[PDB]
Design a protein around this ligand. Structure first.
Ligand SMILES: [Ca+2]
Ligand SMILES: [Ca+2]
Ligand SMILES: [Ca+2]
Ligand SMILES: [Ca+2]
Ligand SMILES: [Ca+2]
Ligand SMILES: [Ca+2]
Ligand SMILES: [Ca+2]
Ligand SMILES: [Ca+2]
Lengths: 100, 100, 100, 100
């Protein structure tokens, strides 16, 4: 599921999405998969920075239903500015997978 | 999970993995994610053909834990020979995601 | 996951945990399962009241990893004081399951 | 999900259900939750023995949607004859939860 407003760093199976770069602005904690960011009010196409928890891989897609351009985010990683990966204010679906 | 031996075509959320090209040889039905094909005896590095069910996306990785080269497989699709995608006898992890 | 601070009543698949009886004090919205309330700062052994959403069952355990005494909570239910079920300030794990 | 026909012992997150005691007869491998055993042809009310994988807890209910009498099954455990727990040929729903 998704939760509004985060703090600190993501735990295993969690992904922190921030509206502004450098982890600022509105934030959301996500676990599991979300095939349509529109199901979350104001989430679609506004994410600018991301944090991925340990033993966790994240896949962010430009379009809903895991379509369009996308990239893989490694465990315990973070991107302060999605523009650097050509996905600023454009993500519309995401996969959150974990492992041992 | 992973289950040995398949027949017909995959249903939503199912992916059929075959040891030989053209959907022949030992087979496996997979749902959800599998971060290490090593967890299933004889599954690692032997897949040659694939079938993905409707409303389903499949992401196959060369290494375990979703690392290494990979590709996205579209719903209701199939590849008779994975050499065509540079992934014959090399898949070691996979993510199966669905949507409505 | 677990998310701090709740309001209103839980929706399907959500369980609201309150630190004080009568749904007062620090609160948490939980979905899915949590095998160790220790993973959430200040959550372990402090729950005093609960609310379970529609089409949802909740299983609260005295110990972590679903061990020790426990009880089943019915959909759309609430307990204003967990002492009534011998589980005040003692829950350490919980399973949240839904059905149609 | 559920899969027909098992062998060996359950891995983490898996539960093996057998139609006859002592792990004989038709068998099914289950992961995740199943709120209505009737969704699986011939599964409802026929289970006589069970095996639960490591770091895994299972909850078997007499009625669907996790209602009626039920018991908890510990990780790496197994019951050769469910009559001993007063649930022979009666299980109709189940929860499969894992932990680290
Ligand atoms: Ca933005
Ligand atoms: Ca988009
Ligand atoms: Ca092969
Ligand atoms: Ca490989
Ligand atoms: Ca309390
Ligand atoms: Ca406790
Ligand atoms: Ca039987
Ligand atoms: Ca029954």
């Amino acid at each position: 599921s998704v939760c509004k407003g985060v703090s600190g760093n993501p735990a295993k199976g969690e992904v922190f999405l921030y509206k502004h770069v450098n982890f600022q602005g509105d934030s959301w904690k996500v676990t599991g998969n979300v095939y349509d960011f529109r199901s979350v009010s104001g989430l679609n196409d506004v994410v600018s920075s991301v944090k991925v928890g340990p033993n966790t891989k994240a896949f962010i897609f430009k379009d809903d239903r895991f379509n369009g351009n996308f990239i893989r985010l490694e465990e315990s990683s973070q991107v302060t500015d999605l523009t650097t990966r050509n996905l600023n204010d454009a993500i519309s679906s995401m996969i959150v997978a974990t492992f041992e």
